[PDB]
Ligand binder design. Sequence first.
Ligand SMILES: C[C+](CO)[C@H](O)COP(=O)(O)OP(=O)(O)O
Ligand SMILES: C[C+](CO)[C@H](O)COP(=O)(O)OP(=O)(O)O
Ligand code: SF4
Ligand code: SF4
Lengths: 402, 402
Amino acid sequence: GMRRPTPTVYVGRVPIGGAHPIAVQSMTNTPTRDVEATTAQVLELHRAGSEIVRLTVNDEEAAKAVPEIKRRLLAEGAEVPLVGDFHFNGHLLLRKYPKMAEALDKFRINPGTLGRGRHKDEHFAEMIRIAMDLGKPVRIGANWGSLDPALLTELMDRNARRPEPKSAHEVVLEALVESAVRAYEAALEMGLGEDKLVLSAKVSKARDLVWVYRELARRTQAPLHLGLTEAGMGVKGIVASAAALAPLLLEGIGDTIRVSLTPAPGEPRTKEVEVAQEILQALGLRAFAPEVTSCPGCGRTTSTFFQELAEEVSRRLKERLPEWRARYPGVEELKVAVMGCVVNGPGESKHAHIGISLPGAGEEPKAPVYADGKLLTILKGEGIAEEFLRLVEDYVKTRFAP
Amino acid sequence: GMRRPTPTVYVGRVPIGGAHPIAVQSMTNTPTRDVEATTAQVLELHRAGSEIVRLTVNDEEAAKAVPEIKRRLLAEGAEVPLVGDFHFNGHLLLRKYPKMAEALDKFRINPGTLGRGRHKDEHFAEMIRIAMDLGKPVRIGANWGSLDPALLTELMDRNARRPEPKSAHEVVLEALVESAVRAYEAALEMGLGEDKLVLSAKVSKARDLVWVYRELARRTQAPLHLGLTEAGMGVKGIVASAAALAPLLLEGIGDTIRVSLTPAPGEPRTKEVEVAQEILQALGLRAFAPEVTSCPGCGRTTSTFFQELAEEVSRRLKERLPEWRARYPGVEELKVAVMGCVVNGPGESKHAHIGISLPGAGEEPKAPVYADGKLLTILKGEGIAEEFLRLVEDYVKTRFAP
Ligand SMILES: C[C+](CO)[C@H](O)COP(=O)(O)OP(=O)(O)O
Ligand SMILES: C[C+](CO)[C@H](O)COP(=O)(O)OP(=O)(O)O
Ligand code: SF4
Ligand code: SF4
């Protein structure tokens, strides 16, 4: 289950591929024609951790805005790469607005939103030609919400000739993979470099996504852009996204990710970037920020004190991070434990860089603190929380000193 | 990647094993001695979907309370099975309080919290004897927060003799597996039935959990209780839990799950049960409630109207569910789509049972609705939301009629 080798594709300054960290990306939801709102959100997403940012380029007004958005970003020294998302008229917009084409750092094509049969091949070829002329990379991104219907008919007739035809659902997933593979092969044949081609083939159900990506990974050599499309709102969207991605990421499949959450009204667009980072950090693939390991608490602990302490520690680590990031290289790998009682508290604290085990039911009112697998001190009284946070600050300064 | 066969273990009326749905469980956080608070929370957890509920049985006052909690549950016709969580003094509490022993529906033993070496074997044997005498099932639950240190030394010396010794971390994971396996074999040898034994071996990091469970699954025949221990707070705990479980569940490993979230202060203990259900539903393993598939929205849609509609649909489905569950068998499998524009909106809506595709940028102000893969109607004007919800109600009545 080691990382799938792939050629490197640069999206701006960010390399994508088997030799590189899995890159977090996101997409804006502001109208792209609104230069102020869109530039602000691109910066917001980038500051949250979005290494690459996509924006829809849906019409001429959007196309006209892109060079000004890019100008404004550069003016503040924000080197975030921009992906243009094209559907239906990508070939017209790229042809008509060469300054937009040049301002983007990558073009997204969807093989199912090119046009009707004869025109499809030529629309696709025009986009690919422009990308080659400008040295831009392309994502060929299929999505089962926009599956090429002629290809689906071809595969439905192939399936019908089988001694045991597969289900309609299965054929749809075959067709999605085929859509991406065919387009990938067509681009290569036209001369686009392996260093300029990323593929995706998204579906909205986890088990299907796994199947699809295993097929992509086997059939192609490209870096893969992995995501569960239309994952939805709230806890459902978070859970579905994690569930879908983890099996693939653990098998070494995927070179960049996007988490497709529906924000609740008033919820920041940066939530999807947090989720993406948590997925990669949970699986030990990247480290972005200190993490807190804590027990659920049970009838052995005093629920509110323990929950308050864990919350307070997490809050403080988040407040310290900007400073820590600047002073203490490697601090993103910090593991801190906050535990409710003696059953697992010392042991889990010993597995962390530093951890505290509160006293639970039946225990003397003292809280041992462990660091690097051994007892550091024992805390008691009021301000356990502030004392522990001081010990954590001390530990960081020593362990992650430059 | 089909379901691992296992013998069936009944926990109360709930069967656990390869022939049965993966059971959702949880654990209380109230002091077990508080009969009113604990009974209330057991009912709350059970009504949220916890098919089995664990409670700590840490001391004599807790032990004395258990038969009254069980009485109170039965008095309201709540047949929820109770698992007693025992550490350090399990053998003393079960011996001293036979009415507690009989009131429980399953005993949890942790091989690392039995006692010191010589006494450990006898403590374990006493618990197992009582379980056999009463016909109770047992979980032998190892946890790396409470790993038997003598076993770890034995395995550290075995490792040191290897031509290429493994890391200390790797040896810890070996020891955790060995702890569970040895105890399982010991229980079987003493005469406890294969129909009375569930195993777990929990760690707090996802990739390690996968390794551990693949080993358990191979080395034993028991049903497995799967969970990422000490998963933590908030989005991190949710994501880590999903990430850890999905690879295993998709490979067919795991017969019951528990999600080990730390509640934020004032957050209900039922959140962990929601998360558990979302994991299983995301992976197509169980269906608990209708789900909404929605796009993230982008610069093609009007952010707030779309986000409000998706939120409103999700809210309404949740309000209708108790009634629907009673009237319309199978409704838990309902899939509804709410989509932002024409790019993926119709296609994704066609994959749902019923879905709506709002008009995005450039489009006529009309919203097609699809059901069973084909156009049902087209909505326009105000009250699109109420009209769509009426269509969904109509669709449910027809499709899931008894
Ligand atoms: C932006 C858009 C056009 O496909 C989609 O509806 C959803 O975004 P997504 O889930 O990131 O999927 P794509 O990579 O865009 O296929
Ligand atoms: C309740 C308790 C005693 O092990 C733990 O700290 C945590 O609960 P858990 O994460 O469900 O892990 P166990 O199944 O109890 O090993
Ligand atoms: S460490 Fe103690 S308080 Fe925390 S859930 Fe475990 S047993 Fe309960
Ligand atoms: S369906 Fe349309 S509005 Fe929704 S994210 Fe996709 S492209 Fe954007």
